[PDB]
Amino acid sequence: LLRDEELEEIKKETGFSHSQITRLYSRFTSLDKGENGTLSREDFQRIPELAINPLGDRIINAFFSEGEDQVNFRGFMRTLAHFRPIEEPLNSRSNKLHFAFRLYDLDKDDKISRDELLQVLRMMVGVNISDEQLGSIADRTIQEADQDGDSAISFTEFVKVLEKVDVEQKMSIRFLHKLAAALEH
Ligand SMILES: [Ca+2]
Numbered sequence: 338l339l340r341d342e343e344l345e346e347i348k349k350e351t352g353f354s355h356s357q358i359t360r361l362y363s364r365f366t367s368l369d370k371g372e373n374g375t376l377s378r379e380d381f382q383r384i385p386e387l388a389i390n391p392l393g394d395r396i397i398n399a400f401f402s403e404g405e406d407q408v409n410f411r412g413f414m415r416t417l418a419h420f421r422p423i424e425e426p427l428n429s430r431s432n433k434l435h436f437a438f439r440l441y442d443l444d445k446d447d448k449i450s451r452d453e454l455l456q457v458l459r460m461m462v463g464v465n466i467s468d469e470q471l472g473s474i475a476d477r478t479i480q481e482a483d484q485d486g487d488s489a490i491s492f493t494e495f496v497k498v499l500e501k502v503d504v505e506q507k508m509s510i511r512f513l514h515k516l517a518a519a520l521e522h
């Protein structure tokens with residue numbers, strides 16, 4: 338059972354209401370198959386909405402900090418705070434875009450390489466996008482973001498290229514809004 342001081346601190350750290358947090362704890366609780374107060378990666382497969390998504394494994398893996406194979410409710414709620422609709426909080430443009438950047442930056446060297454970009458594109462596009470056109474999408478996308486000529490995208494570049502775009506209305510970002518709502522509801 339979630340203690341009230343725990344609930345008040347989450348509320349302040351994350352921006353979820355008392356009510357939202359209570360609902361998410363119950364979802365946390367139903368997902369905890371080992372009844373040990375934490376979730377493993379495999380536990381996240383019982384969120385089929387997440388798991389079936391093309392970036393599912395990546396989104397899930399992102400709940401786990403380096404070295405750790407179990408996430409607690411606090412860790413869980415902190416990650417979800419990145420997914421909240423805007424309305425520096427954890428759902429700020431920067432924090433939210435950093436979560437997204439992290440989906441692409443598989444080796445965590447803080448740059449998206451051409452290959453890393455290709456791997457996400459291959460996961461997301463439809464049946465009729467050719468390997469050739471994949472190369473051109475990856476190259477143009479790098480071209481548009483790259484301002485220091487390393488042919489890789491840094492976080493600043495990733496953010497810059499979206500500086501005057503409404504991130505909040507992007508489909509992938511709206512997935513995250515939807516996910517957080519469905520976990521709660
Ligand atoms: Ca990288």
Ligand SMILES: [Ca+2]
Binds near residue numbers: 486487488489
């Ligand atoms: Ca660059």
